């Protein structure tokens, strides 16, 4: 019932990845909510359960498949299915816990991890920060295998955490930020794996704040500037939504849009 988008690392190209991210964005947003040319994800408040999730079915050259479940309100990876087993991150609240009972309902083995799925927690378990975890088609290929073999004992917890970190950035972050999608396209074009630079990391860390600053802005003007980083780690100040239009593709819902004038 929930929409499924397919992607494979097997012979992936810039174009096939671009098609995939475009499809994900299309299933995440309805087109109802666009502010300063930037689409907003659906409001969690009053969102019917039959509209809450999308599924991303990842296949690889190894002929293995996993299905990630993404929450449409924030593009968050809430869990995954591999064959006979499904695994969910520890829910933040009771309504999220109920929500995930609507996912992978025919799976034989349902597990909820005792840990949450935020970067802080995942990096701790991985024993590596995002800045030291390589991204690209190769890492994603390997991540799909690692997720697939977890239930049978083939995948250690740090490798599982690492693999989540890869999937989240190459799917959810790429969906959120055209800039991050661009960085992943480059890695695919040249088949060259590399850890995310500070421009990628700071955008990921700032998604919530950027969403709020845009939505609370006075005609696009931020009350408080937001500091990002360039690829070389130097500071970049954001004062206005205008500079972000080519960078951010989707925002989390943070407030109601003010009336026009």
Residue numbers in the entry: 5 to 265
Wording from the paper:
Ricin is an AB toxin consisting of an enzymatically active A subunit (Ricin Toxin A-chain, RTA) and a cell-binding B subunit (Ricin Toxin B-chain, RTB) linked by a disulfide bond. RTA is highly catalytically active in depurinating the adenine base at position 4324 (A4324) selectively in a specific region in the 28S rRNA to inhibit ribosomal protein biosynthesis, causing cell death. The active site of RTA consists of two pockets, the primary pocket catalyzing the depurination of A4324 and the secondary pocket accommodating the guanine residue adjacent to A4324, with Tyr80 dividing these pockets. Thus, in this study, we report the synthesis of 7PCAs with tripeptide pendants having elongated C-terminal residues, in which ornithine and lysine residues with an aromatic ring were employed as the C-terminal residues to direct the interaction with the secondary pocket.
Co-crystals of RTA with 4a and 4b were prepared using the hanging drop vapor diffusion crystallization method and their crystal structures were analyzed. In each case, the pterin ring interacted with Gly121, Asn122, Tyr123, Ile172, and Arg180 in the primary pocket of RTA through the same interactions as those previously observed with other pterin derivatives. For 4a, the tripeptide moiety was unsuccessfully assigned, probably because only the pterin moiety was accommodated in the primary pocket and the pendant moiety was free to move. For 4A, the displacement of Tyr80, as well as the T-shaped interactions, were not observed, even though it had the same P1-P2 moiety, Gly-Phe. It is likely that the alkyl chain of the C-terminal residue in 4A is not long enough to form the hydrogen bonds with the residues at the entrance of the secondary pocket; consequently, the unfixed large side chain is free to move, preventing the phenyl ring in P2 from forming a T-shape interaction. The same movements of Tyr80 were observed in the crystal structures of RTA with the potent inhibitors 1, 2, while no such conformational change was observed in RTA crystals with 4a and other low-activity inhibitors such as 3, for which the positions of Tyr80 was the same as in the inhibitor-free crystal structure. Compound 4b exhibited an IC50 value of 33.4±2.7 μM, whereas compound 4a exhibited an IC50 value of 485±33 μM. The weak inhibitory activity of 4a was comparable to that of pterin-7-carboxylic acid, which is consistent with the fact that only the pterin-7-carboxylic acid portion was assigned in the X-ray crystallography of 4a/RTA and no conformational change in Tyr80 was observed.
